[PDB]
Structure formats: structure tokens, C-alpha cells
Amino acid sequence: QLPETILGGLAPEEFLANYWQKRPLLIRQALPGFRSPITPEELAGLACEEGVTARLILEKGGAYPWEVRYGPFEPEDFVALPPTHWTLLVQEVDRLVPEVAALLETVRFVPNWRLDDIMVSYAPEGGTVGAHIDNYDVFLVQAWGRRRWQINHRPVEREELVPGLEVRLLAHFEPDAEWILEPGDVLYLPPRIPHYGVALEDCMTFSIGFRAPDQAELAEAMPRMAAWLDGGRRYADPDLTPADEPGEITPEALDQIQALLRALIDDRERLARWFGCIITEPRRGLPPEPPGRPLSAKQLHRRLQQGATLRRNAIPELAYVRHADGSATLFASGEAYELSPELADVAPLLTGRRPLTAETLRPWLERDDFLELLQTLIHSGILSLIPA
Amino acid sequence: QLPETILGGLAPEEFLANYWQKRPLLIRQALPGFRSPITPEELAGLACEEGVTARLILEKGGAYPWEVRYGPFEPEDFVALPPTHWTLLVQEVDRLVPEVAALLETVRFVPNWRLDDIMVSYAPEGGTVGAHIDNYDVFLVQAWGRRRWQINHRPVEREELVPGLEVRLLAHFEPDAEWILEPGDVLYLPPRIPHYGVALEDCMTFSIGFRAPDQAELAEAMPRMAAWLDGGRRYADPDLTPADEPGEITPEALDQIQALLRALIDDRERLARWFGCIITEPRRGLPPEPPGRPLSAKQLHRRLQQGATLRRNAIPELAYVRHADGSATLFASGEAYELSPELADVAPLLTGRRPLTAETLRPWLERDDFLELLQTLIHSGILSLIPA
Numbered sequence: 001q002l003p004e005t006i007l008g009g010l011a012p013e014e015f016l017a018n019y020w021q022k023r024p025l026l027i028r029q030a031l032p033g034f035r036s037p038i039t040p041e042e043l044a045g046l047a048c049e050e051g052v053t054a055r056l057i058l059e060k061g062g063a064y065p066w067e068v069r070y071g072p073f074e075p076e077d078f079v080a081l082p083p084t085h086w087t088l089l090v091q092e093v094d095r096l097v098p099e100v101a102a103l104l105e106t107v108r109f110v111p112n113w114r115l116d117d118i119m120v121s122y123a124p125e126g127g128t129v130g131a132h133i134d135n136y137d138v139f140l141v142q143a144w145g146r147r148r149w150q151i152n153h154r155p156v157e158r159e160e161l162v163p164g165l166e167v168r169l170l171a172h173f174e175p176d177a178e179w180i181l182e183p184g185d186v187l188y189l190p191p192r193i194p195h196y197g198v199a200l201e202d203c204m205t206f207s208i209g210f211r212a213p214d215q216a217e218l219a220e221a222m223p224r225m226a227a228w229l230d231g232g233r234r235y236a237d238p239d240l241t242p243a244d245e246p247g248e249i250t251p252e253a254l255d256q257i258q259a260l261l262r263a264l265i266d267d268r269e270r271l272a273r274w275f276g277c278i279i280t281e282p283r284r285g286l287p288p289e290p291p292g293r294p295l296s297a298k299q300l301h302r303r304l305q306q307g308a309t310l311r312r313n314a315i316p317e318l319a320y321v322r323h324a325d326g327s328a329t330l331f332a333s334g335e336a337y338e339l340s341p342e343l344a345d346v347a348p349l350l351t352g353r354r355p356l357t358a359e360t361l362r363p364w365l366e367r368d369d370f371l372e373l374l375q376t377l378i379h380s381g382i383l384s385l386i387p388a
Numbered sequence: 389q390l391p392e393t394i395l396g397g398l399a400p401e402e403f404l405a406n407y408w409q410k411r412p413l414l415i416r417q418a419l420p421g422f423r424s425p426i427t428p429e430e431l432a433g434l435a436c437e438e439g440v441t442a443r444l445i446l447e448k449g450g451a452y453p454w455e456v457r458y459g460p461f462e463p464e465d466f467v468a469l470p471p472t473h474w475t476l477l478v479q480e481v482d483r484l485v486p487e488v489a490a491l492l493e494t495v496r497f498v499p500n501w502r503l504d505d506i507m508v509s510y511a512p513e514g515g516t517v518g519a520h521i522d523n524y525d526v527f528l529v530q531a532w533g534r535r536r537w538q539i540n541h542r543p544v545e546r547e548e549l550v551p552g553l554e555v556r557l558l559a560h561f562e563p564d565a566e567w568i569l570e571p572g573d574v575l576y577l578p579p580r581i582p583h584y585g586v587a588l589e590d591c592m593t594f595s596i597g598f599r600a601p602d603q604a605e606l607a608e609a610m611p612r613m614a615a616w617l618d619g620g621r622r623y624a625d626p627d628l629t630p631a632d633e634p635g636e637i638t639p640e641a642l643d644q645i646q647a648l649l650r651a652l653i654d655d656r657e658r659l660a661r662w663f664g665c666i667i668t669e670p671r672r673g674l675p676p677e678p679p680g681r682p683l684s685a686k687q688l689h690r691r692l693q694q695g696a697t698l699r700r701n702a703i704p705e706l707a708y709v710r711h712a713d714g715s716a717t718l719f720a721s722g723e724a725y726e727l728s729p730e731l732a733d734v735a736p737l738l739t740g741r742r743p744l745t746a747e748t749l750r751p752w753l754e755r756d757d758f759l760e761l762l763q764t765l766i767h768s769g770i771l772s773l774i775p776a
């Protein structure tokens with residue numbers, strides 16, 4: 001009961017060509033009839049569950065203006081809140097609530113790894129986070145109540161911030177466009193577009209967020225390259241001449257260091273595996289949860305061909321890569337699974353849009369090595385087995 | 389007390405040309421009349437200190453064959469050891485005992501960053517660590533007693549080890565050369581030469597060890613690069629097309645990822661800083677230590693003119709690089725200190741083999757910029773101030 005995409009009457013090819021990472025776009029009634037599958041009471045319910053990232057922001061009513069209280073929480077923390085001018089933000093709700101993750105099937109024109117999470121916000125009247133920017137694309141989805149969004153179509157290069165407030169707040173903000181959003185309305189913002197939303201009543205917002213790695217993150221992820229190396233090439237200086245100045249890291253020495261790192265980076269087989277892992281790795285505290293009990297290959301096959309379904313639990317943490325051999329590597333929550341060329345074409349399937357069923361899986365379902373793979377993915381918590 | 393180099397009759401030019409990282413060399417009486425500056429009980433005392441890396445290896449007479457016991461120890465651990473066939477090994481003794489670090493100024497024809505540490509080992513009769521190979525250059529300095537070294541001139545491409553011992557022991561070892569070393573004798577081995585050293589009496593050996601980073605290590609030190617990025621360039625796909633298969637990490641995407649990483653390696657000044665910091669960073673758990681009291685620039689200047697000398701506490705952790713604009717960066721125990729072009733020539737001096745006196749520092753002492761630098765270097769325990 002959800003449309004093929006979140007773009008209304010706009011085709012993805014046209015949207016990507018004229019708006020993606022360029023300029024904001026206001027889709028009216030992207031999701032006709034869409035109401036939040038989760039309620040404010042349930043959201044506050046998730047905010048208490050351990051391993052969850054949650055923030056409470058009060059523009060006023062706290063000890064000081066713009067106070068930020070962090071999770072985890074206790075049930076008592078919420079009842080003693082002012083009637084208005086606060087807001088609750090919970091991250092990776094798509095990981096916790098399958099019904100929310102369903103929404104993620106409307107943004108499959110973007111590749112999986114560019115997907116991050118769906119954070120859900122609740123806010124009584126007047127609740128806000130304040131005028132701010134983000135370094136990532138976002139689909140702002142109204143799921144309850146109404147929100148007044150003010151934005152500036154001009155992206156900001158330098159972030160002029162308010163001092164000492166422990167929340168990224170824009171000192172000077174000049175809106176050129178104001179909008180009132182009802183449930184089903186969708187506001188797309190490219191990176192660095194300043195936006196200021198305010199709740200006109202008890203409302204909820206679903207923020208579909210994307211991710212783009214900067215150099216700093218990629219550098220921090222590089223120690224994982226060591227996993228596939230087995231040491232690798234070693235610095236060698238057999239043609240060493242006596243050091244004029246022993247403390248000098250010579251230009252010839254820096255040359256060889258550059259060479260060693262390049263050979264590392266320029267190996268595409270090696271680089272693909274590294275990136276596939278570090279980009280699907282869980283970013284916060286919610287890894288995949290293994291099932292209750294073990295499951296035999298024959299039982300899976302049986303249960304599967306009786307109409308059972310396989311569900312993807314974390315699409316943003318699901319990706320793959322093809323190699324020159326015809327082989328492929330599958331990526332699920334930071335881990336790599338090697339696929340022979342015989343199996344290489346299940347990767348597009350398991351990570352793609354298509355429903356996982358007996359009909360859909362018929363081609364490989366009688367191969368032993370393919371059932372072992374499903375068994376592994378089910379036991380890891382990557383795929384959930386769903387009865388009919 | 390010590391010669392200019394550890395090569396005796398040989399010239400640094402010849403050695404590096406004909407032996408360094410190629411052929412083993414036995415230099416007899418390379419250090420004439422050199423006995424160890426510390427005793428086995430002094431060494432046992434070091435092995436008891438917090439943060440030190442020490443090993444106790446019993447070939448026999450232990451709980452089982454080739455038992456290894458790891459420090460830090462306590463004095464009790466040395467009382468009930470067997471009469472024979474065991475060894476104590478302590479790492480980074482040069483950073484603990486100044487008189488041992490004095491040995492390091494016989495190897496200054498090799499650059500500083502290529503130096504690792506001096507490992508001191510004690511053994512009664514028969515004591516050894518077994519036949520093994522090492523991935524690094526080493527000068528094996530006999531500091532007390534007699535030791536019988538057996539080696540083999542052909543390096544090992546693939547090391548076949550004895551299974552499950554917690555010590556890396558060669559299964560097959562056939563020596564084609566043998567010597568018995570007396571105090572002052574020095575044996576140089578290039579990387580991956582199988583050697584087997586057995587003590588013929590109470591023994592002390594000083595292993596001057598070098599370091600050469602492989603690709604695995606460089607990948608591991610990469611996160612430090614994030615210090616200078618302030619974020620860096622971010623991945624961007626404005627001209628993205630609708631994904632035929634959303635789970636695929638496309639070559640176009642991997643190309644941009646490859647570009648973002650190569651930007652870090654190909655910017656030479658920025659790489660020079662990263663490498664300087666990660667190669668002078670302390671390898672293990674021995675933090676450089678401060679002085680008992682703080683010294684003003686005036687005081688520092690005063691004591692220097694009154695005959696005080698500056699001592700380099702850790703030479704292997706001292707280096708510098710010159711930049712294109714005449715500026716330089718001084719590296720010390722993993723920290724980078726920027727030097728203006730006018731001040732860029734103190735770096736050879738501070739890291740070099742010259743003594744650090746009022747005479748040698750005469751041009752620089754008048755500068756406030758230089759004293760300020762010396763203050764922090766003393767403060768952090770890179771340089772120790774000593775009276776005449």
C-alpha cells in the first residue's frame with residue numbers, strides 16, 4: 001500500500017538529473033494517505049530500549065535554553081515535560097521497526113550504500129531543532145500533524161554558528177521560501193541547504209537520511225584494509241647511501257612511502273572489498289540480531305517452498321560488487337561473502353527490489369552452496385524468515 | 389668510550405653498498421672493550437616496571453617445552469628459575485637506560501626513523517630463543533660472555549614453523565656458517581636470515597633493531613591523517629542515473645572513492661606530516677616522561693651558557709622533513725612541530741648527531757622562537773637538560 005517511489009508523478013531519471021544534490025524540491029502528497037505506523041508513545045518506547053541513539057531538545061523549559069538530554073532513557077523522564085517547545089529525535093528506527101523500514105522501498109533509485117537511516121521525530125506544538133544545515137541529502141516526510149518549513153535555496157559554504165549552545169545553530173538565517181506540510185507531503189533537501197522547521201501541532205517527521213563518505217572517514221576506515229593484506233610489500237632501501245643528516249626523512253624515502261600506499265589504493269579487487277565492508281558496517285550501536293534458534297538447510301528449503309518469505313532487515317547495510325572474473329562479493333553489515341561465478345547473480349537479487357520467495361529464488365534454490373549462504377545470512381540476522 | 393660507527397675497519401659507504409639488506413657481516417671487536425652497562429638484576433628490575441615489554445623463555449624445565457612468560461614481572465618470578473636453558477628479553481631498554489641508548493650513536497649512518505629499539509637479553513648457559521627469522525635488519529652486539537651463533541646465508545621466502553609453541557621456531561634449519569662471539573663482537577643480519585644463538589655461559593646480548601613499515605602497517609596508521617583534514621572532500625554524485633540494480637557498488641563510485649584516497653597520498657606536504665608522526669610515534673607502552681620542574685626561557689638560556697648540555701632521550705623518535713617553501717616540520721614522539729623557513733635549519737641540528745651545547749646552539753639561542761620550542765621539547769621529555 002505504498003507507491004513505487006517517493007517522487008509522486010516525477011520519474012527518477014528526471015529527478016536525479018535536475019534536483020539530486022543540486023536544489024531542493026517540494027513534492028506535495030508524495031505518499032497519499034500515509035500516516036505514521038508508529039505512535040509518539042511507541043517512539044518514546046524505543047527511546048528507552050538499550051543500544052538506541054536518542055536526543056531530547058528543549059528550546060525552553062529546561063534548566064538552560066536549548067538543553068540537550070541524551071539517551072538511553074527511563075519512562076519517568078517523559079511525563080515531566082512542558083506542554084510545548086521540546087522535541088524527541090530517535091535514530092535508526094528503520095532498524096528497530098520493520099514497518100518503518102517499509103518506507104525505504106520508495107527510494108530505491110538511489111543505491112543501497114548511499115542510504116543511512118530513517119530517524120523519527122516527535123514534537124508537540126512549537127517544537128523544533130532550530131535553523132540548521134546537514135552534510136547529507138534528506139527526504140523530510142510528514143507522517144503526522146503539520147510542520148512549517150522555512151528554507152534557503154542558496155547552499156552555505158561557510159557555517160556561521162551560534163556560540164556556546166551545544167546544538168548546531170545558524171546565527172544569521174534568511175528564508176526565501178516558507179511551506180506548510182501535511183501528512184504525505186515530502187520535502188527533498190540536498191546537502192548544506194539551511195532549513196528551519198516548526199511544529200504547528202502535535203506532529204511527527206520521518207527523516208530519510210543518506211550518507212556520503214568524506215576523506216576523514218575513509219582514512220579512519222583504512223585499518224580494515226589490513227585484513228586482506230598478509231603484510232604486503234615492505235619498505236626496502238638496499239641502495240641506501242650514508243645519511244648526511246640522520247634525522248631527515250629524505251625525498252627518496254617519501255617517494256617509496258607514496259608508492260606503497262598507491263599500490264594499495266590502485267588495487268581494485270582489494271579496494272572494492274574494503275569499501276564494501278566499511279560502508280555497510282553498522283555506524284552506531286545496532287548490529288544485526290541473530291534469531292532464536294538454529295535452522296537446517298533442509299528445513300529452510302522446505303519452509304521456503306511452502307510460501308515462507310525472506311525479509312531484508314537492513315537494506316542500507318546490504319550491497320555487492322562484481323569482479324572481472326565474473327565472481328562477486330556480497331556485503332552484509334560489515335562482512336564479506338565471496339560468490340563464485342556460478343552464484344554471482346544472487347547478489348543483485350538479495351540486495352535488490354524484488355521480493356524473496358520460492359518463485360523468485362527458484363533458479364539457485366537447489367544448489368547446496370546457495371542454501372548455506374541463506375543459512376548464514378539468516379543466522380547472522382541479515383535476513384528474517386517470515387511465515388505466510 | 390665508543391667508536392664513531394659500529395663497523396670498525398669498514399667504511400659506511402662500503403657497508404651500505406655491499407651488505408645492507410643483502411649479505412650478513414661479522415665484525416669482530418666492532419666495539420673494543422665494550423661491556424654491558426647494566427647487569428642481569430638491573431635488567432630484571434626493568435622487566436618488573438609497569439608498561440615494559442619483557443619475555444621469559446624456558447626451552448626446558450618449564451611447565452612445558454618452550455614455555456613463555458610475559459611481563460611485567462615481580463622479583464619473585466626470578467628466584468626459582470632453572471639453573472640453565474632459559475632467557476630474559478626486554479624491549480626498548482634504550483628508552484629506559486641512557487647508557488644503553490649511548491650505543492645508538494654508532495649506527496647514525498642510518499636515518500633515525502629507520503631505528504626501532506635496543507633489545508637487551510640475558511641468558512645462562514644453554515639459553516636461547518631458538519632458531520628463527522626476523523623481518524628486519526639487526527646488529528647483534530655481544531655485551532657479555534660467549535655466544536655461539538649459527539646462520540644461513542640464503543634468506544627465507546616462506547617460513548615453515550613448528551606448530552603450536554607460542555614461539556616462532558623453524559622446523560627445518562640447516563646452517564652453513566658458525567661463529568662464537570665475545571664481548572665487543574657484532575653480527576649484522578639482513579631481513580629474513582635464519583639465525584640460531586646459544587649462550588655458552590652467562591650471556592648478555594644487545595640487539596640493535598631496525599624498522600621498515602609494510603603496507604599493512606601504513607594502512608593501520610592512516611587514521612592519523614584525519615587530524616589535518618578538517619573533514620576533507622566528500623563523495624558526490626550529482627549526475628547519478630537511476631540504479632538498474634540498487635545494491636551494486638558501481639565502478640564509477642569506486643573510481644571516485646579511489647580518487648578521494650589518492651588525493652591524500654599525492655598531496656606530498658600533507659603525507660610528509662602524517663608519516664613523520666606515525667613513524668616517530670611510540671611503538672608500545674612506554675610514554676616519554678616530563679621533568680620534575682618547569683624551566684623558563686631565561687633559566688634555560690642561563691644554564692646552557694653555564695655549561696649545560698641537552699640530551700636526546702629517544703633518537704629513533706626524532707625526525708624532520710623539509711617542505712617546498714623552505715619551511716620544515718620537526719617530528720618528536722609522534723608530535724609535529726612546525727618551523728618557519730628562518731628557523732627551518734635547527735631541525736637537522738636537534739635530530740642530528742652533533743652535541744647540543746651553548747656553542748652548537750649559539751646562533752639560535754638569541755631567538756625567542758627557538759627557546760619556546762626547546763621549552764616544549766623539554767616539557768614533553770624529548771630532550772633532557774644535563775649539567776656538565
Ligand SMILES: O=C(O)CNC(=O)c1nc(Cl)c2ccccc2c1O
Pocket residue numbers: 424426427428510532533589590591592
Ligand atoms: O663469567 C662468569 O662466569 C661470571 N660473570 C658474571 O656472572 C657476570 N655476568 C654478567 Cl651478564 C654481567 C653483566 C654485567 C656486569 C657484570 C656481569 C658479570 O660479572
Ligand SMILES: O=C(O)CNC(=O)c1nc(Cl)c2ccccc2c1O
Pocket residue numbers: 428429432466467468
Ligand atoms: O636466589 C637463589 O638462591 C637462586 N637465584 C638465582 O640463581 C638467580 N637469582 C636472581 Cl635474583 C636472578 C636475577 C636476575 C637474573 C638471574 C638470577 C638468578 O640466576
Ligand SMILES: [Mn+2]
Pocket residue numbers: 132133134195
Ligand atoms: Mn536536518
